[PDB]
Amino acid sequence: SGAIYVGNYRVVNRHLATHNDWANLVWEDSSRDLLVSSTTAQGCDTIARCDCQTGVYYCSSRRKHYPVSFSKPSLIFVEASEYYPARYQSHLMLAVGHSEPGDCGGILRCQHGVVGIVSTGGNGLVGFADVRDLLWLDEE
Ligand SMILES: N[C@H]1CCN(S(=O)(=O)c2ccccc2)C1
Ligand SMILES: N[C@H]1CCN(S(=O)(=O)c2ccccc2)C1
Ligand SMILES: [Zn+2]
């Protein structure tokens, strides 16, 4: 579990979005495993605006933050998981690291702020849904 809180937005994995999220929907994209809902309180997170490929992510199944190198966002085949069939996911970054289904929502951060959230795992990789291209998260 986990979310990003920026302005009056909450960014969650689409597959973990609640009824309240869907009832307050701003934007969602199944291909990216992202959903954004509206919030009452202002959030603490700053979104990175950069093409970093190094950062640190939170792994809830280890209670640990790990430094990782990660691929630039691209369109990647993902094998079946507990929460999706095998399918293509867009805007996905991969690193070598541990990720189980419950790790989804852990933040990946670089020197510029939040890069994305854990979205995929298995076969010794962790996949992150990028948010750095969502410039609208920083206004209105
Ligand atoms: N290698 C490229 C092509 C696929 N990716 S992407 O991150 O899925 C993506 C999709 C659409 C718009 C912008 C980015 C980047
Ligand atoms: N192995 C894959 C096959 C599709 N799922 S699913 O989308 O997580 C799912 C789980 C339970 C009921 C309906 C859908 C995982
Ligand atoms: Zn950066």
Residue 39 CB coordination number (10 Å): 16
Tokens of 130: 């990028």
For the chain, how many residues are written?
Answer: 140
Which uninterrupted H or E stretch holds 117? strand 113-120
The 8-class DSSP code of residue 23 comes to H
CA geometry: angle 82, 84, 89, nearest 5 deg:
135
Contact assessment for residue 69 and residue 93, using Cβ atoms and an 8 Å cutoff:
no
Q: How far is the CA of 140 from the centre of ligand 2 (A)?
A: 35
Which uninterrupted H or E stretch holds 90? strand 87-96
What's this structure's resolution in Å? Answer: 1.0
Q: Which of 21, 33, 103, 130 is catalytic?
A: 33
Domain spans of the chain, in order of start: 3-44, 45-140
Contacts of 65 (CB under 8 A, 6+ apart): 56, 57, 58, 59
Q: How far is the CA of 37 from the centre of ligand 2 (A)?
A: 23
| Integer angstrom CA distances of residue 9 from 19, 40, 41, 48, 118 | 16, 9, 9, 15, 18
Cα–Cα distance, 112 to 70 (Å, whole number): 15
Tokens of 105: 């929502």
Position 116, amino acid: G
Cα–Cα distance, 78 to 135 (Å, whole number): 26
Cα–Cα distance, 68 to 77 (Å, whole number): 21
CA 13 vs. chain centroid, Å, equals: 6
The 8-class DSSP code of residue 11 comes to E
Q: Is 44 annotated as a binding residue?
A: no
Contact assessment for residue 12 and residue 119, using Cβ atoms and an 8 Å cutoff:
no
Contact assessment for residue 82 and residue 124, using Cβ atoms and an 8 Å cutoff:
no
Instruction: Name the experiment that determined this structure.
Output: X-ray
